[PDB]
Amino acid sequence: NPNQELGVVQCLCRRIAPLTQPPFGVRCRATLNCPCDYIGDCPGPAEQYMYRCPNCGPRSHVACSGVHQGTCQQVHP
């Protein structure tokens, strides 16, 4: 069988870790801060990373490109 390449990622401890599956989209759970009282969920895009850190062992964390802080136009158009 041919080898299956998996990407690498920086663990939260900052070491380089091998992903065990490709990044996959997820719900972003961050809370928003706009100068008004608006309440709402971040629409993303957010992704979750599964990896096996040589230091930390199995670990995961989520990253999101949505706007969490800023003006009312930036957070909630």
Which positions make up the binding site for Zn(2+)?
11, 13, 28, 34, 36, 42, 53, 56, 64, 68, 72, 76
HSE-CB for 17 with a 13 A CA cutoff:
23
Q: Whose Cβ is closer to Zn ion: residue 50's or residue 53's?
A: 53
Q: Whose Cβ is closer to Zn ion: residue 4's or residue 73's?
A: 73
Query: In sequence order, what are the residues at sequence separation of 6 or more whose Cβ sits closer than 8 angstroms to the Cβ of residue 62?
Result: 26, 28, 29, 46, 47, 48, 49
Q: Whose Cβ is closer to Zn ion: residue 21's or residue 65's?
A: 65
Residues binding Zn ion (CB under 5 A): 11, 13, 15, 28, 30, 34, 36, 38, 42, 53, 55-56, 64, 66, 72
Q: Return the amino acid letter for 47.
A: E
Question: In the complex, what is the shortest distance from the CB of residue 56 to Zn ion, in angstroms, rounded to a whole number?
Answer: 3
